[PDB]
């Protein structure tokens with residue numbers, strides 16, 4: 001089997017991408033944030049505290065003839081940005097782009113933190129990291145990809161995120177028309193539960209490539225590119241007037257600037273992030289200070305190849321017995 005679904009930016013900045021997902025019988029379609037940096041499929045629901053729902057579409061398990069309470073199971077996650085959610089668990093039929101999993105754990109939110117409430121466009125998350133990070137207790141549940149894998153034509157999914165435009169998540173096949181050149185594959189460590197890999201270096205604009213190992217995670221659920229402070233300083237030094245602002249929370253730059261590209265290495269291959277992809281717009285409405293899309297990971301504990309990086313590539317998440325990642329230009 002295969003599946004193929006369009007993913008759409010939630011706003012004009014590509015802050016996140018939403019993908020329609022069919023849950024239950026009859027289908028209830030929710031728009032979920034596919035998140036390779038995490039492993040729970042959770043939804044706003046008829047159980048979510050009413051004051052914490054503000055425009056999201058909810059899953060109502062009592063209206064699904066295939067929903068079953070997973071007795072005794074609870075979940076609770078805290079994300080790197082400080083947001084969180086928790087609740088109980090149902091199993092139900094879940095379909096993405098024509099690919100159907102029966103008995104998928106659908107984690108129903110009883111509580112969500114304010115950032116989720118305040119974003120009416122995201123009805124939940126669909127985790128695509130390794131199932132060892134799933135938070136359901138006392139019995140850990142599998143991700144949608146883990147449940148689908150054996151049925152897929154090939155045990156892979158691909159992320160093709162658009163810049164200011166829709167893109168595609170495919171399951172079970174590699175669309176050879178969706179990228180240019182070849183796909184360069186690189187080793188993955190699953191030791192932390194993530195799609196963790198080592199970039200071979202970087203360049204700023206037309207500058208020379210610096211060969212240096214940068215371990216990080218491919219995380220579709222993180223907006224920005226978080227890299228070591230040395231790398232980030234080298235990038236922003238090429239933008240007149242750019243500076244790190246403790247009060248804003250990262251590097252800002254004059255909105256009148258033209259940003260240089262940023263290149264990262266994948267083995268001997270190179271993925272070029274155009275400068276425009278690094279512009280996240282005014283820090284507040286009407287400001288001439290703009291927020292940068294490349295930020296320091298120093299306070300995180302891990303480097304994160306988020307959407308800013310991934311949207312410049314066609315990315316293969318290869319879930320073979322020994323997982324690997326592939327990157328192609330597009």
Ligand SMILES: COCCOCC(=O)Nc1cccc(F)c1
Nearest residue numbers: 038039076077078079133134135
């Ligand atoms: C095995 O789960 C133990 C509880 O974990 C809670 C928890 O917040 N986990 C978590 C947070 C962010 C990403 C991710 F993938 C997992």
